[PDB]
Every structure is written in C-alpha cells, then in structure tokens.
Symmetry: D2
Subunit: 241 residues, 4 copies
C-alpha cells in the first residue's frame, strides 16, 4: 500500500463523489493529497474523512485568479486529476447564454490554465501524470446534454494535444470517461436520468463512485507507465453499444 | 441539372477559402445562397464572383447581437454550413487568456446560438441539413493546436447531440473534418505547417479548397438523405495514420 | 457524365446495395462490370441496369473463381467490395462451418481480389476502392459476432491499403450502412431491421439507393482528398 | 490477495506479454493456467511463475486441441486471449497459406475458446475476458494488413461479447499494446521514435493493463479498448 509514496496529488472537485473517492484511494496508497472545492465547510470535512494527511484548498475553477492562487499553493504536483465540473441539462432550444458560458468557464477554461501552470513543473522535473475526467455524452448524442458534452469533448482533444506536447519530458496525459454514477449531485438533480441511461448499458446498472475512482488510480499510478494520450471508458458498456 | 433548386443555404465565413468554394458549389446547384463575413467589401466581391443571385450579410460570429441579427436577415434556411472559424497556434505554456476566449467565442459559441435559431425552423418544417466544419487536430494531437483542436472537438460532439435532438423531425447534422488545405490564411500564416502535415499523409499533398467543398455539398444535398450524426474525413488519410 | 472512360467492378452487383451502386455508376458513364454467383440473376441485373453493363459469374468464397474474375476484368479504375453474407447467431449457437464461410466470403475473397486489381491501379497512378462494411462492426449487436468481425477486419484493411496505395494516388474508403431494405433483409431479418431502425435518430430503414449515393461519392473524383476513412450511412446509428 | 479464489487462463502464457500477465495474476492469489504449443518452455514457464500455476499444451490453430483445452479448465473466471502471431508482408506479397494461418490462430481459436469458457462465466454470473489486440488494428501501417485485420476482428468481438454476456455480469475488454520488448519482437525488429513517449515498452508494462482489466478494480469497465501504446493511437 505504498505505490504512490513521495508523490503529491491534486484533485480538483475532490470533496464529493468521484473526486472524493479518487483522493481517498491515492491517499491510502501513500500519496500526499491536496483536494479543492468551493464550500469550505464541506472541503475540510472531506479532508478528514480521507485522512493520511490530506489537506484542503478552497478554489473556484471558474475564476482565473483563484486558479492561479491554487497553482501557487501547490507548485510541486506529480499527479493532477482534473475532476471539478458541472453538468446541468437543457435542450439546445432551451439553453441560455449565461449557462453556456459558465459551463465552458468551469469545465474547460479553469482546467486548461491549471494544467498550463502545473504541467510546466512536471515537464521541468521529467515526470508526472495528468488525468482528465470526461463523460460518455461527449462520445454519443444524448438529448439535453449538448453543452455539457461539448465541454468534455474539448477535454478529450486536450488530452491528445497535451500528451504529444509533454510526452518527450516523461509526462503522461489521459482521460477517464465515466457512465452514469451515483453521486449526491446525480441523485438530487438527475435521479431518473441516470437510471434511464443505465437501462441501455450492457451491465444494466449505475456505478458507485469508487468504481470510477479505480480507473483514475490506475492511470495516475506508475502501473500505467506506458499509457498516454488515451481514453479509458468506465461506463458499463455504454460506448460499446 | 440543379439538385438544390428550391432550397435556401447559409454559409458562415463564406467570403474566402473553404467557405467560398462551398457557397459557389451550392449556388451552381441552384440554391439561394447567403454568405456571411466580417469585411463588407470582400463580402460583396465574393457574392458578385459567385453569381446566381448570391447575397452577402455582414456578421461577426464572436458577437451574439450580430449573430441574432444574422438569424433575422436569413430566417428560413434549409442548409446551414458552419464554416467560419479561426486557428491561431501556440503551445499550452505560451497560450494567452484573451486568445483562448476569442477562439471559443468565434468557433463554438457563435455557431451554437446560430444553430439554436436556424434549427427551430428546420424542425417546424420537417426537413433540413446542417454541416459543421471541424478539423484533423480535433482527432489527433498536434503540438501548438491545443485550443483550436479543442474548439472543433466540441463541435464534433454537438454534431452528435444535435443529430439526436433534431433527427425525429427530419433534420440531419454532420461534420466535415478537413486536413491541410491551401487557403488565403494558411498560405499567409501556416505555410510551412501544412506541408509538414502533408508529408505524413498517405496522399502526400495539401488540398485545394474545392476538394473540401465537394464533401460539404454532398452532406448538404438530398444525396446524403440517410447520413446524420457522422464525421466525413476529407484529409488525405491523416486520421487513418 | 462524371465517370466517363472509367471501368468499375462491383462484387455482389446483382442485388440490393450492389445493384443500385452499379446503376448509379453506369448512369454516370462508367463501364460497369457486376459479379455474382447466380448466372440467371446476373443476366437479369445487367438488363435491368442497361448502359452496356455486363455480368461476370464468380464465387468470392473460391480463390480460383476470384483469380478467374480478375482475369476477365484486369484493368479496373473503381472497385466496390460489396459482396457479403450476414447470417445471425449468438456466440453459443455459432457453428464452425458458418464461421469459416463468413470469413471466406467477406474477408478472404475481397483481400486477394484487391491484391490483384490494385496492382494495375498503382501502376497507372489512379484508382478508388470502396469497401462495404456495417454498423455491427462498430457497436455491439447480439447475434452478429462473426459478421461484425469480418467487417471490422475490412475496416482495418481500408486503413492499411490507404497507406500502402496512397503514395501512387489510389484511394481506399469504407461505407458503413445501417439497416437497409434489400430482398435478403426482408426474407430473413425482417423484424430485426425494424427494431434497429426504432433506435436511430431518423427512426427508419434506408432504401438501397441511399447507400449507393455514398458509394458513388467516394468512387468519383469528387472525393479526391478522401482516403482511409469510413463514411457512415446509418440514420445516426453510430452517433447514439 | 485481490484475485484469491479465482481461476485465470492465459493463452500464450509461456513467453512475452502472456508470461508477465500470468505472473502478476499468480502473485495476486489466482490459480493460473497457462497454455502454449512447446511443452519444454511451457513447464519452465509454469515453474517460473510458481504459486501452483500449471501448463496445459494446446495449439490455437487446431479446434480439437482448443476443445480439449476448454474441457481441462471449464471453471475459468478470467480469460486472457493473448496467443497470436504477427508476420509481415505487403498486400502484393502476402501468400494464401500465411493469410489463413493468421486468421486460424488469431481469430478462430480465440473465438471458439471464448464460446466454451463464456458459458461457465455466464452461468455463474461473473467473469472477465481480456483480448490482446494491436495498434495496427486502428492505424494503417504498411506490411501489417493481415495482422491488423485479425486484431480488428477481435476489437469488434469485444463489443459484441460485451453486449451478449454483459446481461449476466461478464465483462469483456481489449488491450491494445504498442511496440514491446518481447523475445519475438527483438528478433524480428533487430535494429518507436514517433511515439509521444519516444520509447518501447517492457512486457511488464503491458501486463499491468491486463491485470487491471481482469481484476475487480475494473468492475464497471466493459466493451472498451485500453490503449497502452506510449501515445501511438493519439498521434
Ligand atoms: N454520472 C456522473 O456522476 C458522471 C458521469 C460522467 C462524467 N462525470 C464527471 O465526473 C466529474 C465529477 O462528477 P461528480 O458526480 O462526482 O460531481 P459532484 O458530486 O457534484 O462534485 C463536483 C465537485 O466539483 C466541485 N466544483 C463544482 N463546481 C466547481 C467550481 N466552479 N470550482 C471548483 N470546484 C467546483 C464541487 O465542490 P463544491 O461543491 O465545493 O463547489 C465538488 O467537489 C464531473 O466532471 C462530471 O462531469 C460524472
Ligand atoms: N487547412 C485549412 O484551411 C483547414 C483545415 C482544417 C479545418 N479548417 C477549418 O475550415 C474552416 C475554414 O477554413 P479557411 O482556411 O477557409 O479560413 P479562411 O480562409 O481564413 O476564411 C475564414 C472565413 O471566416 C470568416 N470569419 C473569421 N472570423 C470571423 C468572425 N469572428 N465572425 C464572422 N466571420 C468570421 C472570414 O471572414 P472575414 O475575412 O471577413 O473576417 C472568412 O470568410 C475553418 O473553420 C477552419 O477551422 C481549415
Ligand atoms: N441492411 C443491409 O442490407 C446491410 C446493412 C449493413 C451492411 N450491409 C452490407 O452491404 C452489402 C450488400 O448488402 P445486401 O443486403 O444488398 O446483400 P444482398 O441484397 O443479399 O445481395 C448480396 C450480393 O452478393 C452476392 N454474393 C453473395 N455471396 C457471394 C459469394 N460467396 N460470392 C460472390 N457473390 C456473392 C449475391 O449474388 P448471388 O446470390 O447470386 O451469389 C448478391 O448479388 C453486404 O456486404 C452487407 O454485409 C448490408
Ligand atoms: N510489440 C509486441 O510485442 C506487440 C505489440 C502489439 C500487440 N502484441 C500482441 O501481444 C500478444 C503477445 O505478444 P508477444 O510479443 O508476447 O508474443 P510472443 O512473445 O511471441 O509469445 C506468443 C505466445 O503465443 C503462443 N502461440 C503462438 N502460436 C500459437 C498457437 N498456434 N497455439 C497456441 N499458442 C500459440 C506462444 O507459445 P509457443 O511458443 O509454444 O508456440 C507464445 O507463448 C500477441 O497477441 C500480439 O499480437 C504484441
């Protein structure tokens, strides 16, 4: 239980759901974990549940000054899990401009400029692993998810460009594309949606967040030392059908 | 013999390059063609050279008020070609915030809300065809194209979602993903870049803009009556290698 | 007449998607050769098409027949690899003999016909090769395991051939169709294509003429910069 | 401890990627059965692996040998379809006999081994199948036409099998490796530079991907391709 000993791991949106479980797995493997989120009360609680010296830093990925402060507060990261993200739904005809801009500001812009800062240090040191959390709706057309799927699709392309830009200096970049997963947000907002998506999956069920974190752990760890530029689908068969 | 006789088409960025050749092919096929651009002088010259009653409407895809006024001036369209776009290059470490936001405003946001307006009439009438121009860098990792490829990969996802949302009402949606093409902008800005990309293509050459336009015409026309939600790669084999 | 002066060979050109592809190309001025196993159906198909289209009898599952076909039509500019069978069975039900027949017909016959015909294209410096695949080679449909695999092998062959022949100007592409109303899909698989169509954004099956239009495009000079790619003609099947 | 109580069958487990995959699983508590044609290397590989691992001789090109193999291990929880060959020749140079052997070995033998082993997995309601493919099945590399076609067929089978068996809890996935320093590859290549990582892989690096997909860690991963190729597919 020491495969990540000596590595610092930053997990955006790591105070709930898939981010919480990914930070838990990496702390248990000996990494020094930093998690971020907006709600300070819930972030400090999440860092205690995780234990192993995990610490919380408040940051809003939608504000670029906050992103730059986060990068300043963790200038030595070996594992970056870009997990923070929102996914409100609306048909194209119902979608508003302000919601469009917040989705791109949060899901794309904040992750882009955090990577620009953190990867520079990884490239200097000659080692690092970056994992971007995407979505099945970025690979198939589900009505109501045009904007959300478009943000994660841009992340899929960034995974490829970044892997080619940083690979010469030993830095790996990959995506984890999850299917419908039971998290507090999906339970509150999209309770029937995830169940409807699940009826069309081969495994015919939704995922526990731990099952998604297991794929994040693999790609972050040195077990995936030859894995870069790729997408790891964790969707119970959704992309296959 | 004019297969598009009776239809109205709107080509964004149709005053030079791939867009101008797509408009010329459609106007020759008997469609009533509207072309848009930012510079009014070169717009009127383009409309004049195209002939066949083609008209110009000035619009800036980056300004949403301008996009709204464009939708008003061309309300009922049967063919929409989303071709307008920009592609400046920079490494992820050199990329600036202003340039990031302009690339997404022009390539993604403007097309999104033009479609939201144009597709409403296509759905009500029960027929229509939308063609989105993407890029090879959205499917393979090219250093220096992180943002640009990310904007076009968002558009690839929108093609899938939109085809699922508008399909029941007869509206088709597809992408054309071009390889390196000789245009006014690539010959003045990316002269050595396109030949470098051409060297690793199975066809070992760059394309004329008309060669890209033939794919756009096919997808816009009743010949492609069963084609929707897909990408047509016109790239000399780049995606295959 | 876009295809004037060009010779086109269509395997399985006596019925269904192949028949309509040959009809389109003949109407474009091409000298079309259609092939099939049944001599009566072939002669009737050539008359139905017109335009000097001629029939040549061959069995793609027999390599001697394949070699005999390439000898009767040595100089082809357009080759449409359309002949194929698609019987359905779950993996637990699938028999050995049907497995071998599916690969013999759908893969081996096309491979060595391409090896023969593409030699002349490469030496002449031009040509277009269109391989007919299937949606089941891209998504998992129960009961189509062997069929999808043969067409997936064909998809990969498109990429390898595009790279090997592209230096000499020869293009290679795949057409991946959705459920199409041919006499075979109506006799057998009658309700399967309906179930598939209900899950497509267009919510319908295709007429064979609609698949043929994609074959015509990739085969013609209009697609001069298109090689190594898959053109999906499936009502949105791949996107959902 | 993670694979304790499970039985894993690795075809081509006496060398290269297969040997390292079977090694990782045995060291995780699985009862490992490896298979190959050569009996002397097979018994050595079984002793090399240790942990009670055993060797069963079989030729994937002979369906009677494949049937005998399945009957000697009817209770497999993990199946790694790793045996394969990859000779090269341009399309114009490819011979009929070599074409048929490539499909007989890489596709037919795997297909009917799966048809037997998946029955027990479906009955029990759990199991994991891992098919080893190749980058050449997704990109066009001159000289790999037949080899890549056989692996592309496996890629499609992964999806169909995921749909057919997933209705009863059985997962099926592909592992697509890049260039790897196995004994066959070192002899065939003699004297990679286009990959983002700019190096070839050690066999153990491919085996780690096999292990993850085979283990309960990947409990929600099915029908997918895991690319372990130094960035080849992305470029
Ligand atoms: N079904 C699924 O759950 C599913 C499926 C596919 C993909 N995904 C992807 O998986 C990722 C995580 O999913 P999830 O269900 O675990 O989400 P979640 O439970 O709602 O948690 C999201 C995390 O992101 C943080 N966050 C949200 N907006 C932020 C902002 N503007 N700045 C900084 N942090 C912000 C939240 O912290 P605060 O509450 O303090 O703001 C929270 O810690 C997302 O990117 C999602 O797109 C999820
Ligand atoms: N090698 C290639 O050329 C290549 C390869 C792959 C993909 N593509 C894609 O193909 C499309 C066209 O490429 P191209 O080379 O033909 O471009 P181009 O020659 O430079 O022409 C661009 C057109 O878009 C218009 N435009 C630019 N910015 C605009 C804005 N903010 N608002 C409204 N109109 C705007 C321009 O009008 P004004 O001149 O008046 O500003 C012009 O008519 C682009 O979307 C590009 O991403 C090109
Ligand atoms: N729904 C669909 O129809 C659909 C969907 C996706 C893909 N496809 C693919 O599209 C292609 C054509 O489909 P289709 O429905 O139009 O087929 P079809 O109507 O049943 O006709 C098949 C053609 O192939 C010939 N053929 C069959 N076996 C042959 C052999 N061993 N050697 C030589 N010729 C042979 C037949 O002629 P003879 O009978 O006289 O031998 C016939 O001309 C097939 O490759 C199929 O896999 C079809
Ligand atoms: N660079 C790479 O090495 C590379 C790259 C991409 C994909 N792959 C894939 O990875 C897999 C393993 O690669 P590898 O380099 O480790 O191969 P390898 O070292 O040559 O070992 C192949 C194994 O398959 C067995 N085998 C061969 N033919 C057989 C047959 N007819 N029946 C039964 N067993 C048979 C061999 O046993 P015997 O010696 O006793 O016959 C041996 O154990 C292959 O499927 C290959 O396609 C490899």
């Amino acid at each position: 239980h020491m495969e990540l000993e000596g590595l610092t791991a930053l997990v955006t949106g790591g105070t709930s759901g898939i981010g919480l479980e990914s930070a838990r797995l990496m702390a248990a493997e000996g990494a020094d974990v930093v998690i971020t989120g907006r709600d300070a009360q819930r972030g400090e609680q999440a860092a205690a549940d995780i234990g192993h010296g995990a610490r919380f830093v408040q940051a809003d990925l939608g504000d670029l000054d906050s992103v730059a402060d986060l990068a300043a507060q963790a200038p030595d990261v070996d594992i970056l899990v870009n997990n923070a993200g929102i996914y409100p739904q609306a048909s194209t005809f119902d979608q508003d401009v302000a919601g469009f801009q917040q989705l791109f500001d949060t899901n794309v812009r904040g992750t882009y400029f955090l990577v620009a800062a953190a990867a520079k240090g990884m490239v200097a040191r000659g080692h690092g692993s970056i994992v971007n959390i995407t979505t099945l709706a970025a690979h198939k057309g589900f009505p109501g998810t045009s904007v959300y799927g478009a943000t994660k699709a841009a992340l899929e392309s960034l995974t490829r460009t970044w892997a080619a830009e940083f690979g010469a200096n030993g830095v790996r970049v990959n995506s984890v594309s999850p299917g419908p997963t039971r998290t507090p947000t999906t339970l509150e907002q999209l309770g029937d949606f995830i169940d409807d998506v699940a009826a069309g999956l081969p495994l015919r069920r939704t995922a526990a967040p731990e099952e998604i974190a297991q794929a994040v752990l693999f790609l972050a760890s040195p077990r995936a030392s030859f894995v870069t530029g790729s997408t790891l689908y964790v969707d119970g068969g959704g992309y296959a059908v």
